[PDB]
Design a protein around this ligand. Structure first.
Ligand code: MG
Ligand code: MG
Ligand code: MG
Ligand code: MG
Ligand code: MG
Ligand code: MG
Ligand code: MG
Ligand code: MG
Ligand code: MG
Ligand code: MG
Ligand code: MG
Ligand code: MG
Ligand code: MG
Ligand code: MG
Ligand code: MG
Ligand code: MG
Ligand code: MG
Ligand code: MG
Ligand code: MG
Ligand code: MG
Ligand code: MG
Ligand code: MG
Ligand code: MG
Ligand code: MG
Ligand code: MG
Ligand code: MG
Ligand code: MG
Ligand code: MG
Ligand code: MG
Ligand code: MG
Ligand code: MG
Ligand code: MG
Ligand code: MG
Ligand code: MG
Ligand code: MG
Ligand code: MG
Ligand code: MG
Ligand code: MG
Lengths: 58, 59, 95, 90, 42
RNA sequence: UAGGAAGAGUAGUACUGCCCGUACCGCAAACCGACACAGGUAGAUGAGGAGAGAAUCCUAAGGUGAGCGAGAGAACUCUCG
RNA sequence: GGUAUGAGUAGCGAAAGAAGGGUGAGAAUCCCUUCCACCGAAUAUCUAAGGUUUCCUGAGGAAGGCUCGUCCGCUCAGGGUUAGUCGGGACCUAAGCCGAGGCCGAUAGGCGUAGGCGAUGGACAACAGGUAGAGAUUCCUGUACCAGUGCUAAUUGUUUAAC
RNA sequence: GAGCUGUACGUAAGCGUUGAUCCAGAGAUUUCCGAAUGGGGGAACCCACUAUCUUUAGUCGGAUAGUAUCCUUACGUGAAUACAUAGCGUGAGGAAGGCAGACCCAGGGAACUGAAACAUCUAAGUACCUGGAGGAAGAGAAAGAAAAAUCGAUUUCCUGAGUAGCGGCGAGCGAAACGGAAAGAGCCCAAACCAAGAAGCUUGCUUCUUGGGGUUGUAGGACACUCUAUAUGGAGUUACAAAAGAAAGUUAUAAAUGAAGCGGUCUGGAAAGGCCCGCCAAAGACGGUAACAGCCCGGUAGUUGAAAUGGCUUUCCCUCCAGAGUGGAUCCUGAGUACGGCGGAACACGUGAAAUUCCGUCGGAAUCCGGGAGGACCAUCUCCCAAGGCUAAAUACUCCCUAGUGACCGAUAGUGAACCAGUACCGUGAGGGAAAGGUGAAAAGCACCCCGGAAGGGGAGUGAAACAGUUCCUGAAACCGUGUGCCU
């Protein structure tokens, strides 16, 4: 579950209350399942919205 | 050992068979309590090993 | 070891110092030697063994090698041993 | 080879009691099938084998001064030769 | 009726060598018993 | 049926048939209970008289006399009349 | 860790023994005989599990055995388990488990398709006698069955096609 | 270079100067399980298929080889579907697993505890799990540190300094630069542009591959001219391109040689000790030997030595290679990047006035008249040129090997383990986890007699000693007894 173009994926960090209690959470990448052809043949792969912004296959 | 190297492979192969037949008979006599010279067994085993070593060297 | 079976040794330490004998056996793993007529012990032997009348047998027991010196047939005295090569094999030499 | 498969004869009151019945008891290689034993015995002794019965003996636990361990596992083959077949000697 | 009702099969299926090897944590156990130098893994 | 096919069956004859288990205990002193432990341990079989019966009492086949004993016959305790 | 005290005390774990004979250095306790007594839908006979040599024979009596011990499930030696047909595998699948690709997921992995594994179930050919220190539907005798194989003999088939 | 067939208390049969046993280098053999890989499996088992050979009258047997999965990559076949793709097959390469319970980098990440309670904070980015490794890793040739006016990659140590700071401004946390040292080393791309294809056909323009070129700040390069090189020189497998060999030296892995007292005498079981004489010493290390040895033995100093294998160092081979100057028409100099908002994290720095660095998300430059930093921010000045990569040494650690050391332990200590110990034993399992060293110099390990079934004793003998008798140096105390001087 990772951007095939970039490598964007889940990363951990803290959620913080007011009062500054911390608890672990993640930041997921905005991955979208799309058909592209990294290799000649097309295929449905995870790609980040950020990677799609501009010039990709679709 | 050097005398073994004088022989042909086929001739060595025949010497092995002869030694294996001898070793079998020794073990058979040993089992039936008829051997006496029990030191022959080790001699023959070594000889067989010597044959098979020379032959593997040939290749 | 500086001596071996057959050697004529003088004994330089123990109840038997001054006595000489022939080396009947060497035990290089124990670093001991068996000298003829030296270190006699009385073995209380049961009949069972090769000895069909048993009895108190008087035989030689082994001495420590460092307690005997080699006898040079020329001088007939205890000598330390050197090693000199003739050509083929090396040989013991007196000093 | 055949003399690998047949290890040694078995000499016991039981083994010796059935020699007259033309049944010969051998200790055979632990991997040897009774078919391999049949053809080995025929090669070695020049006899016609009627049947081979075979049994596995597990190792027997033996002590020797606070050291304990198992004797070798054995495979025992009883080889019955035919009426017409020549005997094995022992 | 006591705990411990022996079964040859259940012993090997739950604790045997191949069951230990079949999981990563099972392999940690084998590695740990080898490290301690146990005569008997599994 | 699709397929594959010159060999097929029938009779007779003799030959061939591997590996693992097989001992012994198994209501038990051998299994599970630290014990030669009044406990626990699936299934098959489980005779006769009287009886509905595998109940009950006495027996058959078969198995057993239980790994401390000899006296004594007080209090008391337990189990009984 | 050793050794006391309690103390020669509690206990010796459900139960019927007896005498004669034997063995032996030694006998309530081992062997034999006879009588007595107990279980008998079991305390009998098989057998699965489990145990793993405890089985048989010959020696033994330190320790173990709640006493004793000449005896033993104990010690030491030798021995002992035989299968085409019994049970399991070279057959089958259930629950369940694994699972090529696949799907999912910080890592590790989780799930799952084909496909496999997996009896507690399905399928599948041997009986009666004998023998015995220790195995027996396994050994032996007799009489079988199942699946194959070659070898004889006829028989039929050899491209509208036996099988 | 004379014995040997391991322990260990055997019996037997044998071997060895025609050189054994033994030591070192190199080979061969190396069952089964295990990633385990032909399929399966309850590890150490079961069951195959395909070739080739072998056996039998044929089944039945035997031998050898191949046969996992994934990735990459050739080639071939090849659907819905016409081309084709997927799929399927074959052949090459490669991976897989383990571990030094260490060190290193990354992903994920506690709590007890401290704060005399506790929530921010601490513990701590610790323990632990997972992945990746390497002999080290990481870092690294400035969009740096500064502002004594200059320095010149990184890392590590000393110092700065418990300073500046951070902080329920609590508990606590806590730098950096300068200065001094160890060690030192620098390089390659991307892009302009050139050539050659290849394709798209935008059809003479554009983007794709290979090669050349080119690597940087008051700029460098391309591009114009110009001078010299095209192996003259130079450089290499530790970056800077990458594989190969030789030879010589040296080190390692066995060994060899090696001085001087049987000196006298005393005690003693024994002399290495005492007393009295000598001697060697580049050797008076250590150990052994019947008590304490430079001169008895193994040795030690010194001096020699290697058939074989491995390491290292050189040299040769082999391989590879353009580098100065002058202009500044134009062109190039890393884009979903830098940066910003929002949410987190890392920075000693807890969102703060919060620079710097990273992550998610959304927005989103300039691009030489350009860009970044100097702790909000602007201006000036100064120093730098990001969004690509590589790079030894100084540093960390030790499962190991070799040689040594210790005002370290000496059997309840020291390892859990001096001894067949991760054993026995306990536990379904993960896991937990002991106890236990000493005869003597030498077995000379008690012939023989006596009591006893034996055990065990008493003699006799061995021995310095047996009150050293096969667990046997010493042998305290508790505790158990016998005897009896005084008392009851
Ligand atoms: Mg069988
Ligand atoms: Mg248990
Ligand atoms: Mg039976
Ligand atoms: Mg019971
Ligand atoms: Mg019940
Ligand atoms: Mg009866
Ligand atoms: Mg009392
Ligand atoms: Mg009382
Ligand atoms: Mg009482
Ligand atoms: Mg009782
Ligand atoms: Mg009843
Ligand atoms: Mg018995
Ligand atoms: Mg007793
Ligand atoms: Mg007995
Ligand atoms: Mg199912
Ligand atoms: Mg299925
Ligand atoms: Mg199955
Ligand atoms: Mg029986
Ligand atoms: Mg039969
Ligand atoms: Mg030699
Ligand atoms: Mg396999
Ligand atoms: Mg507190
Ligand atoms: Mg000397
Ligand atoms: Mg004297
Ligand atoms: Mg002394
Ligand atoms: Mg000494
Ligand atoms: Mg932020
Ligand atoms: Mg912070
Ligand atoms: Mg700024
Ligand atoms: Mg952002
Ligand atoms: Mg900035
Ligand atoms: Mg400022
Ligand atoms: Mg500041
Ligand atoms: Mg730049
Ligand atoms: Mg200790
Ligand atoms: Mg002590
Ligand atoms: Mg300890
Ligand atoms: Mg003692």
């Amino acid at each position: 579950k990772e951007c095939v173009i970039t490598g964007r994926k889940s990363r951990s960090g803290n959620k913080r209350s007011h009062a500054m209690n911390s608890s672990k959470r993640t930041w997921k990448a905005n991955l979208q399942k799309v058909r592209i052809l990294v290799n000649g043949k097309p295929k449905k792969v995870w790609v980040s919205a950020r990677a799609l912004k501009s010039g990709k296959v679709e | 050992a050097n005398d073994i190297r004088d022989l042909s492979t086929t001739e060595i192969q025949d010497q092995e068979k002869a030694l294996k037949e001898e070793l079998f008979n020794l073990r058979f006599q040993l089992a039936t309590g008829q051997l006496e010279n029990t030191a022959r067994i080790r001699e023959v085993r070594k000889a067989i090993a010597r044959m098979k070593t020379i032959v593997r060297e040939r290749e | 070891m500086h001596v071996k079976k057959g050697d004529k040794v003088k004994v330089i330490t123990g109840k038997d110092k001054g006595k000489s004998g022939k080396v009947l056996a060497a035990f290089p793993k124990k670093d001991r030697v068996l000298i003829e007529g030296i270190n006699m012990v009385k073995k209380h032997t049961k009949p069972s063994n090769v000895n069909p009348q048993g009895g108190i047998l008087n035989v030689e027991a082994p001495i420590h090698v460092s307690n005997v010196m080699l006898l040079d047939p020329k001088t007939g005295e205890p000598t330390r041993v050197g090693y000199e090569v003739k050509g083929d094999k090396k040989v013991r030499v007196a000093k | 080879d055949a003399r690998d498969i047949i290890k040694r004869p078995v000499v016991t009151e039981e083994s010796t009691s059935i020699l007259d019945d033309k049944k010969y008891t051998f200790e055979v290689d632990t991997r040897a099938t009774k078919t391999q034993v049949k053809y080995a015995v025929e090669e070695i002794f020049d006899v016609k084998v009627a049947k081979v019965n075979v049994m596995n003996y597990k190792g027997k636990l033996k002590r020797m001064g606070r050291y304990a361990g198992y004797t070798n596992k054995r495979r025992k083959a009883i080889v019955t030769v035919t009426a017409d077949s020549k005997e094995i000697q022992f | 009726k006591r705990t411990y009702q022996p079964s040859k099969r259940k012993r090997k299926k739950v604790h045997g060598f191949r069951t230990r090897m079949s999981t990563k944590n099972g392999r940690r156990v084998l590695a740990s018993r080898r490290r301690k130098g146990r005569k008997v893994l599994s």
